[PDB]
Design an enzyme around this catalytic site. Sequence first.
Site, PDB file in Angstrom:
ATOM      1  N   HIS A  62       0.840  -1.217   0.000  1.00  0.00           N
ATOM      2  CA  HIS A  62       0.000   0.000   0.000  1.00  0.00           C
ATOM      3  C   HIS A  62       0.874   1.265   0.000  1.00  0.00           C
ATOM      4  CE1 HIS A  62      -3.280  -2.752   0.915  1.00  0.00           C
ATOM      5  NE2 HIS A  62      -2.672  -3.128   2.028  1.00  0.00           N
ATOM      6  N   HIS A  92       5.526   7.080   6.674  1.00  0.00           N
ATOM      7  CA  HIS A  92       5.248   6.683   5.312  1.00  0.00           C
ATOM      8  C   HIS A  92       4.668   7.888   4.577  1.00  0.00           C
ATOM      9  CE1 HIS A  92       1.513   6.237   7.593  1.00  0.00           C
ATOM     10  NE2 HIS A  92       0.942   6.684   6.488  1.00  0.00           N
ATOM     11  N   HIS A  94       1.817   9.207   1.200  1.00  0.00           N
ATOM     12  CA  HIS A  94       0.744   8.978   0.228  1.00  0.00           C
ATOM     13  C   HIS A  94       1.043   9.908  -0.933  1.00  0.00           C
ATOM     14  CE1 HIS A  94      -1.794   6.991   3.344  1.00  0.00           C
ATOM     15  NE2 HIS A  94      -1.083   7.781   4.128  1.00  0.00           N
ATOM     16  N   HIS A 117       3.376  11.074   6.703  1.00  0.00           N
ATOM     17  CA  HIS A 117       2.736  10.778   7.969  1.00  0.00           C
ATOM     18  C   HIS A 117       3.756  10.195   8.926  1.00  0.00           C
ATOM     19  CE1 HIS A 117      -1.525  10.569   5.993  1.00  0.00           C
ATOM     20  NE2 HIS A 117      -1.127  11.803   6.255  1.00  0.00           N
ATOM     21  N   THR A 197      -6.210   4.412   6.434  1.00  0.00           N
ATOM     22  CA  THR A 197      -6.350   3.114   5.771  1.00  0.00           C
ATOM     23  C   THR A 197      -7.086   2.167   6.706  1.00  0.00           C
ATOM     24  OG1 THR A 197      -4.172   2.342   6.575  1.00  0.00           O
ATOM     25  CG2 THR A 197      -4.257   3.338   4.422  1.00  0.00           C
TER      26      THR A 197
HETATM   27  C1  JDR Z   1      -4.164  -1.647  13.811  1.00  0.00           C
HETATM   28  S1  JDR Z   1      -2.676  -2.546  14.359  1.00  0.00           S
HETATM   29  C2  JDR Z   1      -1.214  -1.782  13.753  1.00  0.00           C
HETATM   30  N1  JDR Z   1      -0.032  -2.116  14.253  1.00  0.00           N
HETATM   31  C3  JDR Z   1       1.070  -1.530  13.807  1.00  0.00           C
HETATM   32 CL1  JDR Z   1       2.585  -1.986  14.495  1.00  0.00          CL
HETATM   33  C4  JDR Z   1       0.986  -0.562  12.812  1.00  0.00           C
HETATM   34  C5  JDR Z   1       2.212   0.099  12.309  1.00  0.00           C
HETATM   35  O1  JDR Z   1       2.141   1.197  11.753  1.00  0.00           O
HETATM   36  C6  JDR Z   1      -0.277  -0.243  12.317  1.00  0.00           C
HETATM   37  N2  JDR Z   1      -0.417   0.757  11.292  1.00  0.00           N
HETATM   38  C7  JDR Z   1      -1.708   1.204  10.808  1.00  0.00           C
HETATM   39  C8  JDR Z   1      -1.747   2.632  10.376  1.00  0.00           C
HETATM   40  C9  JDR Z   1      -2.665   2.901   9.378  1.00  0.00           C
HETATM   41  C10 JDR Z   1      -2.795   4.192   8.886  1.00  0.00           C
HETATM   42  C11 JDR Z   1      -2.007   5.210   9.402  1.00  0.00           C
HETATM   43  S2  JDR Z   1      -2.226   6.802   8.741  1.00  0.00           S
HETATM   44  N3  JDR Z   1      -2.281   6.665   7.031  1.00  0.00           N
HETATM   45  O2  JDR Z   1      -3.560   7.318   9.217  1.00  0.00           O
HETATM   46  O3  JDR Z   1      -1.002   7.618   9.133  1.00  0.00           O
HETATM   47  C12 JDR Z   1      -1.073   4.951  10.414  1.00  0.00           C
HETATM   48  C13 JDR Z   1      -0.944   3.645  10.904  1.00  0.00           C
HETATM   49  N4  JDR Z   1      -1.354  -0.864  12.800  1.00  0.00           N
HETATM   50 ZN    ZN Z   2      -0.804   7.696   6.178  1.00  0.00          ZN
END
Ligand code: JDR
Ligand code: ZN
Length: 258
Positions: A62, A92, A94, A117, A197
Amino acid sequence: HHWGYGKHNGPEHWHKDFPIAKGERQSPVDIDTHTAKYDPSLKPLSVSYDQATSLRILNNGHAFNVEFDDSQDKAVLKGGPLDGTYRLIQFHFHWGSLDGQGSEHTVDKKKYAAELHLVHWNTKYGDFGKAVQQPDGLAVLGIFLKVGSAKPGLQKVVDVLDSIKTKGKSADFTNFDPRGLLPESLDYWTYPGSLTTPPLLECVTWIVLKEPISVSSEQVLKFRKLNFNGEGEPEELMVDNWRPAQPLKNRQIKASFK
Ligand SMILES: CSc1nc(Cl)c(C=O)c(NCc2ccc(S(N)(=O)=O)cc2)n1
Ligand SMILES: [Zn+2]
């Protein structure tokens, strides 16, 4: 038939597996700059990344995540709208297929070429998995990218991308200093939101910097050479991995400035 950003599994489809997609505090959102109210009770943001320890970079199908050692208090975000201390776990981006789109948040409907992010979890909850189950579990620092002059601090990231082209590939990525990705000003907007996401959990205090960083055309072009697919599969370029703005509903976006 897993979620993605393709022609048939994109953001408009996510609600079927993740009903919270139509929830009351979803992200991203459009930031209407005239309606965001200056809040003099807000504090300067405190970004302490001097001790950050990067470990690895991963193509997860992704985006790509630059992962940090979060086994002790090193790289932390505090102050601003936050109570307590949040530990950096990964960053990361987008981005778009073209310079005219790619960001998740928008500013008076303006889309930037990309959005960074920096993801942090609230140390009061002990680990990330527990934190995402709480309304104040995460703090994500969002930084817009526009195309212009190169960002020297990003080049180490750009150069390793050829080694993680396809889903599931990872590479050692030590000693990367994320201070090199910050703009000059830490003026910000803030509002309560969600992961952008799946699983779209409503656990994020969003802190979006007003000042974008500049990256070069060549730098973002290299993001666009990454693949959504795994090795030995038909090539699907990793582009347009952004969720569009969601209804603001019963929320107020606050400004740290002016
Ligand atoms: C739900 S368990 C879990 N565990 C770990 Cl260890 C991670 C590691 O990142 C994670 N990441 C999901 C995540 C999705 C979206 C975003 S965003 N695009 O809103 O910044 C940040 C984080 N989810
Ligand atoms: Zn993000």
